Design a protein around this ligand. Structure first.
Ligand SMILES: Cc1c(/C=C(/CO)CF)n(C)c(=O)[nH]c1=O
Ligand SMILES: Cc1c(/C=C(/CO)CF)n(C)c(=O)[nH]c1=O
Lengths: 315, 310
């Protein structure tokens, strides 16, 4: 069976994700590589009206105390569902075409983001910003789809100073320049990388839970649990009077561990020119995991899906 | 070589049984070879959020009274439905690795109060019909329905509407309001659900029959697909956007492999209990995946019950 390389470009926004990605796709021909781009048309029109605007306006009104935490949370939670929808459907239709893990791939499929972006990372940051409850974050976590083999994810690294500068120059429609949110999202993605490494080094969150109080994967020693996503969830809302997590929330963390531990995570250094990033990413794809497809007709089906997606939801 | 499991999801529109109905189900769970995962009312009222059911019904009421907009109501219903479904989704996700292929009496029978689709598809679709949820949100929930594992036996209820109104009025839940429009909506959705499974199982192709919505199995107009001929979901030329069409493809895949069973609730609580046992002889069993799966399952269900059930 012909092979597939799937690569999800993810991480915080504002780093040069898109430019880098497009430059890589520009190196292929057409039958070689396809791009599933950012679904901005879904976000601005198809799913709801100006979802990014709504998110940033809501956080703003919260900060100013014009609306309550509960009011912000219902909006943020609903908004995140709309944000996540294209990633989620794409995963569900792709799933039956993906075979076991597997020399040049017949097809390279590059994604602008993975479902965890909208189900885990942005919600966890909004929780840090006080505009989402931890119960809602964990509900999203429980809904993360099963991790398909050959799930390669690229996260970004960039100094905070350079990040703040780059971000100010590429605000999206409706976006406001919230540096607290930038700090939150950078922190969440740092924790994410540590979490994957922690799990792959044999970390068991239940064993280390009691060590809690008060970045890179695919390399390095095992992180402390306090430096992983698990640390976010020792919140009073989630704790029984006897002090431990309610089991329902503990089960969500079990799901978080299962989903992340089989992912192949890489870190791209964005602190360089657009061409530099492209070639960095290219080099990085050499150590990435390919899968077989399920049928021989899977390949063109996949190209059709990607192009259809791009035409309808891409800018 | 692995032990066998029978999973049974008791679902359908709420308010059809009797309070003495569930006791027998708890009673049935009294055996060591049957566990009964109960309704997670404590999660809804306290753990996930405060009085989620009250929040839901008050919101519809205020919308009905003109005190809030359709948009205001939608964001509330959407985020509330996340809270409602969380216990089902976490449970499904931790159970998933333990379920093998299809398979005498089973080593263990697991009876759930509701399946994930109740909170991801059915109540959301009913709220869409009540004008308090966008169809895009409903299809986003649909897209997140976990893959249908082998042996997914869903029990749906049959009860004439008037008798249903009677029973429902006599056991309102905390924060609930007796809304006849919602009863009709939720009854309609579940009816369409049952039709939708038969449609799919008889080889119905929604993409093939789609045009019939504007011009031996149910007519597509009598399936859930008819709800998503919603104008929000269509391009200026009337075509369904592909993103929503893919969500319908998912809907089809999830629903087709479910095994539906109809339980007549128009009888005594003991009669209902007996009927449920009668139904089990046709339900699909599976192997589990490890020798430790069975006790792990019992533990999950008992812990769920103790923590989140009443
Ligand atoms: C994916 C995602 C994003 C990221 C975007 C582009 O990276 C959209 F602005 N943002 C900014 C959110 O607020 N929530 C999300 O789920
Ligand atoms: C499962 C579910 C229910 C059903 C309940 C009892 O079956 C809670 F009252 N209700 C009433 C909703 O509004 N949403 C849901 O997701």
């Amino acid at each position: 069976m012909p092979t597939l390389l799937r690569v999800y470009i993810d991480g915080p926004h504002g780093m040069g994700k898109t430019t880098t990605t497009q430059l890589l796709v520009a190196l292929g021909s057409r039958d070689d590589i396809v791009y599933v781009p950012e679904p901005m048309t879904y976000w601005r029109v198809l799913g709801a009206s100006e979802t990014i605007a709504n998110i940033y306006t809501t956080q703003h009104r919260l900060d100013q105390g014009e609306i309550s935490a509960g009011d912000a949370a219902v909006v943020m939670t609903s908004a995140q569902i709309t944000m996540g929808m294209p990633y989620a459907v794409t995963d569900a239709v792709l799933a039956p075409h993906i075979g076991g893990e597997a020399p040049p791939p017949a097809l390279t499929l590059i994604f602008d983001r993975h479902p965890i972006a909208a189900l885990l990372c942005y919600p966890a940051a909004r929780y840090l910003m006080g505009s989402m409850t931890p119960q809602a974050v964990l509900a999203f976590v429980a809904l993360i789809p099963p991790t398909l083999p050959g799930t390669n994810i690229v996260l970004g690294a960039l100094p905070e100073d350079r990040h703040i500068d780059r971000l100010a120059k590429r605000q999206r429609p409706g976006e406001r320049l919230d540096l607290a949110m930038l700090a939150a999202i950078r922190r969440v993605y740092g924790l994410l990388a540590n979490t994957v490494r922690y799990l792959q080094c044999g970390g068991s969150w239940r064993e280390d839970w009691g060590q809690l109080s008060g970045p890179q994967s695919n390399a390095g020693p095992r992180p402390h649990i306090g430096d992983t996503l698990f640390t976010l969830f020792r919140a009073p809302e989630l704790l029984a009077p006897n002090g431990d997590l309610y089991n329902v929330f503990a089960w969500a963390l079990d799901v978080l561990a299962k989903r992340l531990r089989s992912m192949h995570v890489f870190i791209l250094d964005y602190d360089q020119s657009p061409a530099g990033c492209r070639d960095a990413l290219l080099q990085l794809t050499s150590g990435m995991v390919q899968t077989h497809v399920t049928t021989p007709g899977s390949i063109p089906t996949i190209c059709d899906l990607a192009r259809t997606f791009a035409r309808e939801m891409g800018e």
